[PDB]
Amino acid sequence: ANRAYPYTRLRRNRRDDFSRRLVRENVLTVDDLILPVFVLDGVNQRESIPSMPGVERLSIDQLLIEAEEWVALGIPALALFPVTPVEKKSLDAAEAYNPEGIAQRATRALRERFPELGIITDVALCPFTTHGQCGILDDDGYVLNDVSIDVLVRQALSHAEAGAQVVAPSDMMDGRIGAIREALESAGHTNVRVMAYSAKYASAYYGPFRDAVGSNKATYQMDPANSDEALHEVAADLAEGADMVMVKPGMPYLDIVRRVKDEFRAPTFVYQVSGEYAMHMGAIQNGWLAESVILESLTAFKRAGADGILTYFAKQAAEQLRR
């Protein structure tokens, strides 16, 4: 529109808080926050995670205790990540679909106690394989796509059976969203949402999560260099029946968030991963960055087009928003 200085001075709107507030393009609210949480097998158990300062692994009872306050703060949903006892790992990943596995038990407990709180279970075989790869290995050590799906489908069904409102397949197998959706539909789980991890990269930013849960990748997770490829990933997942789509990691992939939102106009989520949390929190603890950087990081996801954010900062942010 031929806007030219000095007729246009972009500073005028910035002059006063009230005008800054009037033109502010995006706001983060508690509607936008999803808290991931590492769940242990026992009773009366909490563990600190070395590479995620301030985040605890919680047994189910402890989860239920802390969830009262997450609920009170208005956090809409949790994303559960079980911490599988080593003795329950196997080459067939069968613990994935064990009806009394951690995820399944946590889910039923939370669904009963906090009926309005959303529960997003993780559909993935890496927490359950003795080797830690995101699926069933062939003789060469390659992750078999279609065979891994069969396990994933049985897992997802078990989650729906436990009452999960959302299942989130994080594996990066091709075709899995459609196979899971078909199974859910066949089984009558009409309303179970599927939150696809659509554009999940082969990233160095996951380091701490491995420490958190107790666990090559380039043959299934995406190359960091690729952008256009992410749109093809998403497109397939929407076609296959995903209700929501996700980019992971998050800040390092904000451009992807923006392209995905712009291209598909579908419910788009983003994961501020363990390494992102660790680097921010470590800097805040060292006195190198102000705590205000938490809300800045989260505001960036909204600005980029995310509808919702999986973030280990969800409770702190909710607290800050509520002020």
Query: Which residue, 202 or 266, has its beta carbon nearer to Zn ion?
Result: 202
Contact 135, 171 (CB under 8 A): yes
Q: Is 122 in the site for Mg ion (CB under 5 A)?
A: no
Judged by CB under 5 A, the number of residues near Cl ion is 3
Query: Which residue, 51 or 145, has its beta carbon nearer to Cl ion?
Result: 145
Query: Which residue, 98 or 165, has its beta carbon nearer to a second copy?
Result: 165
Shortest distance (Å) from residue 315 CB to a second copy: 16
Q: Is 171 in the site for Mg ion (CB under 5 A)?
A: no
Tell me the CA end-to-end span of the chain in Å, nearest whole number: 39
Interface residues for a second copy in 13-32 (CB under 8 A)?
13-27, 29, 31-32
**Contact pattern for a second copy over residues 297 through 316, marking x by CB under 8 A:** x-xx-xxxx-xx--------
- Give the span between the Cα atoms of 300 and 26, in whole angstroms: 9
Contact 153, 179 (CB under 8 A): yes
Interface residues for Cl ion in 152-191 (CB under 5 A)?
190
- Give the span between the Cα atoms of 106 and 108, in whole angstroms: 6
Q: Is 34 in the site for a second copy (CB under 8 A)?
A: yes
Query: Which residue, 214 or 267, has its beta carbon nearer to Na ion?
Result: 267
- Give the span between the Cα atoms of 10 and 18, in whole angstroms: 15
- Give the span between the Cα atoms of 235 and 239, in whole angstroms: 6
Which residues touch 7 (CB under 8 Å, ≥6 apart)? none
4-11: list long-range contacts, CB under 8 Å, 24+ apart: none
Is 315 one of the annotated active-site residues of the chain?
no
Instruction: State how beta strands 244-248 and 268-272 pair.
Output: parallel
Q: Which of 88, 89, 248, 261 is catalytic?
A: 248
Is 200 one of the annotated active-site residues of the chain?
yes
Interface residues for Mg ion in 241-260 (CB under 5 A)?
none
- Binding-site residues for Mg(2+) sit at 233
- Catalytic positions: 200, 248
- Binding-site residues for 5-aminolevulinate sit at 210, 217, 274, 312
